[PDB]
């Protein structure tokens, strides 16, 4: 048996682990648990959409991180108040529930009998209402790791924001190094082997061989976003003019968070099409983000003389643009 927590909260070095122990470690007869706490961080699954599941703008003003794990599952919202255990095994021996199950035992270890259980879709309901506890799994050819995390302290509200009830609020005394113990307490037993965790920094290559590597790999721009599989914008609004409404189209195809196909339509009478070309065209090619406004105004602002009216409706456009970026 072997038992490892993290001092760090970041989470792309906390992952970056992960995938190490997973390339290495035999966990052959040598099964391995790994705590890790992270600061806060949206985590969003082998394959999903960044633009899709979070409000990156608001993210982006909160010192909000986001990243993208090796693992499948879906989008979780990560913490200080986040306990994330990962159960490395080999791929013979691999039991999702046997996993769950320990950390209920774990839990009602320190509240005696809560009203916590395992599901179906293997998260766990506190109270059959609340849910606390999330999936996600990672299968190699010999080991497969199955990843995990706990609601000790995270604020669904704050949370709640990031879309497209917590364990503390109902014991103060359920504080994650409590529940870590807990955990780590359960697991020692679960093999027999001194129900020591054996803390480390996720940066110290002394013990991880070129382990800094992969963590500024998953922080690449180029993986974060770059992975999200192929994905098309077909929408519209209007604007009040006048006052009729004037319609916008935009169509837009992304490939690897460049974008593809870019057409963005609006009324020559009301803004000059060579400037819709002016962008559509500035933005083949480009990556799929908030556009510089700078940039953005540039475009014209040196071009096109000093229309007030021009700029005020060219505004008007990336307005409603970046509000979709």
Same mark, same amino acid.
């Given at each position: 048996g072997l038992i490892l927590q993290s001092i760090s909260n970041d989470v792309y070095h906390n992952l970056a682990v992960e995938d190490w122990i997973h390339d =290495?470690? +035999?966990?052959? #007869?040598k099964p391995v648990l790994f705590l890790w706490r992270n600061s806060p961080t949206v985590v969003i699954g082998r394959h999903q959409n960044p633009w899709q599941e979070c409000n990156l703008n608001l993210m982006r003003e909160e010192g909000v991180k986001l990243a993208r794990r090796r693992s499948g599952g879906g989008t979780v919202y990560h913490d200080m108040g986040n306990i994330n255990l990962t159960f490395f095994t080999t791929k013979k021996k691999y039991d999702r529930m046997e996993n769950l199950k320990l950390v209920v035992r774990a839990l009602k270890a320190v509240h005696?009998?809560?009203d916590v259980q395992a599901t179906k879709r293997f998260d766990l309901l506190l109270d059959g209402q609340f849910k606390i506890s999330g999936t996600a799994s990672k299968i190699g050819r010999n080991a497969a790791y199955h990843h995990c995390t706990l609601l000790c302290g995270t604020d669904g509200t704050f949370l709640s924001s990031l879309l497209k009830k917590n364990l503390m609020e109902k $014991?103060?005394?359920?504080?994650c190094e409590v529940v870590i113990n807990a955990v780590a307490t359960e697991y020692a037993t679960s =093999?027999?082997? $001194? +129900?020591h965790i054996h803390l480390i920094n996720?940066?110290?290559?002394?013990?991880?061989? !070129?382990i800094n590597s992969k963590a500024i790999e998953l922080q690449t721009w180029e993986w974060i976003y770059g992975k999200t599989p192929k994905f098309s914008v077909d929408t519209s609004f209007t604007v009040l003019h006048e006052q009729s409404h004037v319609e916008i189209k935009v169509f837009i195809d992304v490939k690897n968070g460049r974008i593809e196909v870019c057409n963005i339509e609006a009324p020559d009478h009301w803004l000059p099409l060579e400037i819709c070309d002016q962008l559509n065209s500035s933005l083949? #090619?480009?990556?799929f983000s908030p556009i510089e406004t700078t940039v953005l105004t540039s475009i014209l602002h040196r071009?096109?003389? !000093?229309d007030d009216e021009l700029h005020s409706k060219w505004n008007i456009l990336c307005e409603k643009i970046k509000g979709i970026m």
């Open positions: =290495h470690m +035999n966990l052959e #007869g005696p009998h809560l $014991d103060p005394t359920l504080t =093999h027999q082997i $001194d +129900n996720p940066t110290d290559e002394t013990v991880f061989p !070129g083949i #090619g480009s990556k071009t096109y003389p !000093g």
